[PDB]
Design a binder for these strands. Structure first.
Ligand SMILES: [Mg+2]
Ligand code: NA
Ligand code: NA
Ligand code: NA
Length: 325
DNA sequence: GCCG
DNA sequence: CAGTACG
DNA sequence: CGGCCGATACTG
């Protein structure tokens, strides 16, 4: 990043607008930031800023005030509720709506939430692991976690393919959580395995809490939970597992590898080509309404590998490490 | 907020 | 359904 | 004007 001095200040607003619920304004700032940190050199002039995709007149203004005042006047008028909204929104399971409600109810600290707020089952787990859920783990630990899941899975079916995705696959030094994709080459042995996999991981005491896990449904697609490796000095870590049919392997891997912003940009590109891209598949000639929403099926394109998805979109392939946005 |  | 979440 | 990712996946 050659514009850290700028991106660090815009980050404050982006986050402020986000916790307040102004999602689209927040996105604007976030995409402007993803652009500056991705710039091949430091910005210097107002015009030079406007030439950058993702930065408009207003944003360019703010960029000059920073390079031209070392500061930004807007950061001094942010509501006093923001810090608290961010404190609350950082509880897993609580978003802008819940944070704003708690604030309106007079709550101002986690002690207030703990003693007076009504919490959903997920939020109670989020609060209990508040600090741990904000920490990142060394990638070496992510490996240990992936291996624990892989071994348990292959224990009852040696053919199961398990791959750590997310920031881990993108080669980052640390990871926020561990994303494990599980599928099977025969395109069938993946069905109804969550029940066995989870209880196995539970038997060894690996899983400590469950956030999202529809186990009554044999069609369960994901498990979002908490785990902890054995031994001293271990922290509770977020574990996200998805089981997918082999025919959707490439799209699921591309999805689960991210980054999130990379996925969104790629999906937006596919749409401009009359296609649709998701973790399930890439389709061409889909039917959309007057608002751009898909309301009719197109034709699912053959995508045995990630490269195929890039190729079909007229895009040069990009290693996972280069999808870090 | 940005962009068409 | 609205809310929150995953990348 | 109006989309900004996903006809995305759970929860209650
Ligand atoms: Mg991750
Ligand atoms: Na621009
Ligand atoms: Na949250
Ligand atoms: Na459940």
């Amino acid at each position: 990043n050659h514009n850290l001095h700028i991106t660090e200040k815009l980050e404050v607003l982006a986050k402020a607008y986000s916790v307040q619920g102004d999602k689209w304004r927040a996105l604007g700032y976030a995409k402007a930031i993803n652009a500056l940190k991705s710039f091949h050199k430091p910005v210097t002039s107002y015009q030079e800023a406007c030439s950058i995709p993702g930065i408009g007149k207003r944003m360019a203004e703010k960029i000059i005030e920073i390079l031209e005042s070392g500061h930004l006047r807007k950061l001094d008028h942010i509501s006093e509720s923001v810090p608290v909204l961010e404190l609350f929104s950082n509880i897993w399971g609580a978003g802008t709506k819940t944070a704003q409600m708690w604030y309106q109810q007079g709550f101002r600290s986690l002690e207030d939430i703990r003693s007076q707020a009504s919490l959903t089952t997920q939020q109670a787990i989020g609060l209990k692991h508040y600090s741990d859920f904000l920490e990142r783990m060394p990638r070496e630990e992510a490996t240990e976690i992936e291996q624990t899941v892989q071994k348990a899975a292959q224990a009852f079916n040696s053919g199961l393919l398990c791959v750590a995705c997310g920031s881990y696959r993108r080669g980052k030094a640390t990871c926020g959580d561990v994303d494990v994709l599980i599928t099977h080459p025969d395109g069938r042995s993946h069905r109804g395995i969550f029940s066995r996999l989870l209880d196995s991981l539970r038997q060894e005491g690996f899983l400590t809490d469950d956030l999202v896990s529809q186990e009554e449904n044999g069609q369960q697609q994901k498990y979002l939970g908490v785990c902890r490796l054995p031994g001293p000095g271990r922290r509770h870590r977020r574990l996200d597992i998805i089981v997918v049919p082999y025919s959707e392997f490439a799209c699921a891997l591309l999805y689960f590898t991210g980054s999130a912003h990379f996925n969104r940009s790629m999906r937006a590109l596919a749409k401009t080509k009359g296609m649709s891209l998701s973790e399930h598949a890439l389709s061409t000639a889909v039917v959309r309404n007057t608002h751009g929403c898909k309301v009719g099926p197109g034709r699912v394109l053959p995508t045995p590998t990630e490269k195929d998805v890039f190729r079909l979109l007229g895009l040069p392939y990009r290693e996972p490490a280069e999808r870090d946005w």
